[PDB]
Amino acid sequence: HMPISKKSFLQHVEELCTNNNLKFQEEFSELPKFLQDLSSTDADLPWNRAKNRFPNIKPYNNNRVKLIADASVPGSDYINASYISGYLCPNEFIATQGPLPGTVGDFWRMVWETRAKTLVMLTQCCHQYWPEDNKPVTVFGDIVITKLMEDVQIDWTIRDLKIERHGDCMTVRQCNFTAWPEHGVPENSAPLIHFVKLVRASRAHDTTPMIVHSSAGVGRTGVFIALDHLTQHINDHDFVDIYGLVAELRSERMCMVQNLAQYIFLHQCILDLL
Ligand SMILES: [Cl-]
């Protein structure tokens, strides 16, 4: 196993595609779904199981996002969310599922406690966890959310939200990509790549994470985080290692880049960029 040079990349992909994606499938089937010997037992505890949309998609104990715990309430520290490294720093991202109705409060508690100023939503539209224009204030525990603005563009919608607790407050920008097809991957890579760049340009200049979500927090979320890595990488280097990147992402959250179509789409994006 080795990274692939930019000059060799198209030939590499052509070889993977031949004989009905024979080698693409072989390769993708080589990647285990999860890392052997990293526990995910916290996510399997009885008091946490209803906080997971899919019983087979769980964060690892070591890098799950831990909410402030109440010692008298088991599971008060739990959300199905994982820290994921970015290209320039560890813990740049949190990969999470879109909240379940019963974990909306937990989701906003995560936003508050991590001081996250940017959310990336890859679905439409799956529970709306932000206020409606006609009911623009919502309350979860001691956290209050106020919708401040909405900006609907062709391939995404931007929403600014105020979050407050005990009078302290923060503004959070939600970047909601709206151009992902109901089935399969985007036919055209350009809108998603533009969205990746837009999100990065909007980010807070502090060490706080960006929260990225999709239904399971692994498929579309994995593609988005992988593209944010790959787009930066190819500006600094003349080789690319999508296989190794996915193996690293899976070492931080099981099943990141969940299916062969998503894996192939990452290669198509690189082809389009070169
Ligand atoms: Cl979602």
CA dihedral (258, 2, 82, 112) in degrees, to 10, reads -120
Nearest residue to 42 via CA among 67, 56, 71, 62: 62
Contact 213, 98 (CB under 8 A): yes
The technique is: X-ray
Q: Give strand pairing partners of 240.
A: 4
Give the resolution to one decimal, in Å.
Answer: 1.6
Edge-first strand listing for the sheet containing 156-165: 81-84, 93-97, 210-214, 118-121, 168-177, 156-165, 143-152, 137-140
Q: Which two tokens stand for residue 234?
A: 């190819």
Q: Residue 187 Cα, ligand 1 centroid: separation in angstroms?
A: 20
Q: Which residues contact 97 (CB under 8 A, 6 or more apart)?
A: 52, 53, 54, 57, 80, 81, 213, 214, 215, 216, 217
Contact predicate 197/212, CB 8 Å: no
How far away, in angstroms, is 123 Cα from ligand 1 center?
5
Residue 126 alpha carbon to ligand 1 centre in Å: 6
Those residues whose C-beta lies under 8 Å from the C-beta of residue 25, and which sit 6 or more positions away, are: 260
Q: Letter for the amino acid at 84?
A: I
CA 153 to ligand 1 center in whole angstroms: 19
- Residues after which the chain is broken (C–N above 2.5 A) are 125
Determine the distance separating the centroid of ligand 1 and the alpha carbon of 73, expressed in angstroms: 27
Q: How far is the CA of 220 from the centre of ligand 1 (A)?
A: 9
Angle at 196 between CA 191 and CA 200, to 5 degrees: 145
Q: How far apart are CA 67 and CA 153, in angstroms?
A: 34
The domains found in the chain, sorted by start residue, are: 1-274 (3.90.190.10)
Q: How far is the CA of 139 from the centre of ligand 1 (A)?
A: 20
Q: Pinpoint the alpha helices (H) of 96-241.
A: 104-114, 190-202, 220-236
Query: What separation in Å is there between the alpha carbon of 28 and the centre of ligand 1?
Result: 25
Instruction: Print burial letters for 113-138: b (CB count within 10 Å at least 16), e (below 16).
Output: ebebbbbbbbbeeeeebbbeeeeeeb
Backbone angles phi, psi at 272, to 5 degrees: -65, -35
Q: How far is CA 84 from CA 14, 212, 218, 221, 249, in A?
A: 31, 10, 11, 11, 7
The one-letter amino acid at 61 = N
Q: Kindly write down the DSSP assignment for every residue of 243-274, as one continuous string.
A: HHHHHHHHHHSTTSS-SHHHHHHHHHHHHHH-
Cα-to-centroid distance, 166 and ligand 1 (Å): 28
User: Taking Cα atoms as reference points, which of 219, 238, 108 lies closest to residue 174?
Assistant: 108
Give yes or no for a contact between 125 and 131, defined as CB atoms under 8 angstroms apart: no
d(CA 112, CA 153) in angstroms, rounded, equals: 27
Q: What CA–CA distance (Å, rounded) separates 126 from 178?
A: 13
DSSP string, 4-41: EEGGGHHHHHHHHHHHHHHHHHHHHHHS-SS-TT---H
**Strands 118-121 vs 168-177: parallel, antiparallel or unpaired:** parallel
How many Å lie between the centroid of ligand 1 and the Cα of residue 183? 15
